Write a protein that binds this DNA or RNA. Structure first.
Ligand SMILES: O=P(O)(O)O[C@H]1[C@H](OP(=O)(O)O)[C@@H](OP(=O)(O)O)[C@H](OP(=O)(O)O)[C@@H](OP(=O)(O)O)[C@H]1OP(=O)(O)O
Ligand SMILES: O=P(O)(O)O[C@H]1[C@H](OP(=O)(O)O)[C@@H](OP(=O)(O)O)[C@H](OP(=O)(O)O)[C@@H](OP(=O)(O)O)[C@H]1OP(=O)(O)O
Ligand code: NA
Ligand SMILES: [Zn+2]
Ligand SMILES: [Zn+2]
Lengths: 384, 455
RNA sequence: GCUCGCGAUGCUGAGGGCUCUGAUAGCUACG
RNA sequence: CGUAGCAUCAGAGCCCCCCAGCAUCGCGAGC
């Protein structure tokens, strides 16, 4: 009921589990089967009374190359922790609309207006990420197993494999370094059979630890937001996790003025979670506070089982962003740059988020850790 | 509704024969057959139930009327003279023929070179029957030469994407056909060429070439989403490493030979764009155009990744604004079809070699895609030097008054090419059409590569 | 300490095949 | 009113084949 780091971790684990149970008919629903669960919890104080479960999700798979959407209707990455961040973005958009509904609703929105233009979180509002296991890539690859009291730390931390950017590789096991032989995916290349490379969860969480979790579109309204803590339900290796999350790019420099290399609390839970039996389900559930029920997405297609777009896809998010843009006065924008109303350009209007991304990519390259691998440029050239 | 189930309700006593299996892992291919009302049908797929469902598809479509029609899966018919059969049946015939001949050249798909990502081929039609179609050439490959291996003297291939190799081996077929006409007064009836009223030669009537590619060609014809089938036509260049393409920016300088080893790479055009180019200046190239009138593909069959709207854009529609073309040149609008038993995607690395074979060769030639030369470092039969040698042989034989464009004592490859006045003018109009459509400059590779001579 | 080459034992998303079980939509046959 | 037999999903069991990294250990070499 109080908040020192271990009981905070145990509390967020408790909360995400319990919310998941409520949404799955006390874990009796067919959509309770999972190999990885992840969740976001918001805190407003030292009291579990004030702590609320912002989102929950599951999933261990990414999209098949054939199913990338040139309209932003599919989910590329259904690892449970990626999905939980996207559900958090739905919550952030909803809180912006709650804010500017009327001057009486504004006091219940988590945002205020900011001295530097745009909007920011109100004080002592924090976000905690929970994952039932360690994130693929640098935080996991070297030790995919529960730790032991006997020699817990890494015996070879100076190997060049340590810290490397690594891609999930379509149809292959493992997470693969960005070998210096090629770095450009092409849309036609991938449809043909080049395997879709998707940066590992450890790398995405490092990137969120530089540019914030709110993405580029939301940064046009809101100052960057960062996870206060990362809590792992099993497979917690501290040296590996802290390497993966921030310590490998401490060489980053020249970040634009609100951005920083965030170093959230990392922690495991008291009673580590149990490896779930059975095959891993091919679906991913997701829930954001203020939803009546879970949404279930087929991870390999990026869409629900009837083929509808997720409330979490590029296109739905873009639509949320436009709803808010329409209600935001021109003077209150964090960027007055004008860009056409296509997903890719609208993102380019986040000039200093883009600059931050550049410093990130440079830090990895200078560090010898490889060049970040992006999606085919055609992925984001769509309109509403 | 599921085809196997519908056919079971129709003819409940179903025996499906399992015709054995090919490949392993993702390159698995099963074939499943059934006999309905006396006729014998086939289906191909990665897994038995898909092969079975496609056999049942052939069944219900052949014995009864068609099936589901997604719409992008249905095909643009050609510009005029809808000659050769139903579009789908011609498509499936062509794809079977190329796939068969590839089997023949690879000891029924067992040889080490049978493993491939893209298979392409050219098939010649001479009548309305599909009995006397004939495979002219067969090729594979999805890689290009590295600039470290380009030749100042014409001994290396630049581009080994399957369809490009297919066209060049076609050119070998065309030199052979002219040599056939010339070397004996009687072999003219056997040839595909005849003398042209405008001078030079032209193809005999109803001789058509059909291009087959196991996938939509790289570049603009592939920039779309296969499962949302309901988008701007830029030019693109192949990238330094691996398959696929990126669009060109019009403001980048044209290449100069040493300076594109020092700086920006020696970029090569995407297959979608090269095939639009072929739809304007024809497939025979410039040298052959000194001897022959322009030749055009009549069909383009895609063994997978077919979508009618985007293929149409990439092949002709995106330069429908071209005008002022030389005599005999046109914007060719061929048939665009997919096939019934479409190929599955095989995620994985593309092989490093390119197989090529023309009708008349006795065995495949295996080229290292990255060196543009064969297994033993020799120049292939397709490189610029060898083709110019064929062309010079043919120039030694044509009387000077039969040349469609006058040239005497040819010495330099580039000079001989420049002699093709009208072809170079059609090339100029194609480049103009692309620029004025807002789609980009053609990346002309440095012409110092063509400053060489036979001896 | 690392890197490179060779070797060994394991670890960690695809494809394929076969068997069982429940539904759902069918289709026959018989009393 | 039942039983038997002849596409979908959904779950379970037994196999085969990848994947390109990673761990641990050996051998040779270089820094
Ligand atoms: O991490 P994910 O949840 O999978 O989504 C991200 C996100 O794109 P979307 O929020 O539009 O889906 C990034 O965009 P930002 O949030 O940083 O604005 C984008 O990176 P870019 O903005 O630089 O395009 C990145 O795509 P990429 O992999 O090309 O970096 C993409 O990750 P995935 O492509 O793996 O979904
Ligand atoms: O089949 P490709 O590999 O695409 O070869 C063509 C062909 O070159 P060669 O005939 O010497 O092999 C073209 O020549 P023509 O058929 O038009 O005579 C030439 O175009 P030029 O007319 O400008 O020589 C073009 O090169 P480019 O892209 O520079 O126009 C070149 O394609 P590659 O250069 O990519 O091999
Ligand atoms: Na990107
Ligand atoms: Zn992950
Ligand atoms: Zn190509």
């Amino acid at each position: 009921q109080l908040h020192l780091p271990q009981v905070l971790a145990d509390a967020v684990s408790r909360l995400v589990l319990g919310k998941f149970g409520d949404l799955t008919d006390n874990f009796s629903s067919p959509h309770a089967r999972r190999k990885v669960l992840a969740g976001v919890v918001m805190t407003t104080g030292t009291d579990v009374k004030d702590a609320k479960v912002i989102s929950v999700s599951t999933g261990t798979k990414c999209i098949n190359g054939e199913y990338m959407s040139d309209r932003g209707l599919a989910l590329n990455d259904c690892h449970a922790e990626i999905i939980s961040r996207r559900s958090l973005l739905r919550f952030l958009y909803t809180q912006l609309e709650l804010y500017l509904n009327n001057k009486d609703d504004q006091k219940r929105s988590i945002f205020q207006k900011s001295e530097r233009g745009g909007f920011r979180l109100k004080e002592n509002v924090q976000f905690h990420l929970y994952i039932s296991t360690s994130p693929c890539g640098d935080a996991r690859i070297f030790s995919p197993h529960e730790p032991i009291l006997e020699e817990p730390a890494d015996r070879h931390p100076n190997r060049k494999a340590r810290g490397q950017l690594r891609t999930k590789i379509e149809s292959g096991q493992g997470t693969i370094p960005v070998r210096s032989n090629a770095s450009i995916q092409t849309w036609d290349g991938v449809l043909q059979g080049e395997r879709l490379l998707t940066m590992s969860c450890s790398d995405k969480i490092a990137r969120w630890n530089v540019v914030g979790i709110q993405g580029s579109l939301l940064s046009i309204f809101v100052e960057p937001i960062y996870f206060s803590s990362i809590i792992l339900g099993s497979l917690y290796h501290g040296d590996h996790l802290s390497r993966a999350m921030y310590q490998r790019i401490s060489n980053i420099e020249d970040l634009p003025p609100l951005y920083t290399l965030n170093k959230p609390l990392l922690s495991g839970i008291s009673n580590a979670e149990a490896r779930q039996p059975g095959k891993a389900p091919n679906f991913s559930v997701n829930w954001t506070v203020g939803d009546s029920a879970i949404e279930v997405i087929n991870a390999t297609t990026g869409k629900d089982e009837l083929g509808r777009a997720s409330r979490l896809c590029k296109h739905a998010l873009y639509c949320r962003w436009m709803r808010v843009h329409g209600k935001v006065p021109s003077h209150l924008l964090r960027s007055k740059i004008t860009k056409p109303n296509v997903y890719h350009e609208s993102k380019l209007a986040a000039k200093e988020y883009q600059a931050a991304k550049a410093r990130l990519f440079t830090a990895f390259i200078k560090a010898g850790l490889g060049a970040w691998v992006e999606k085919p440029t055609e992925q984001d050239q769509f309109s509403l």
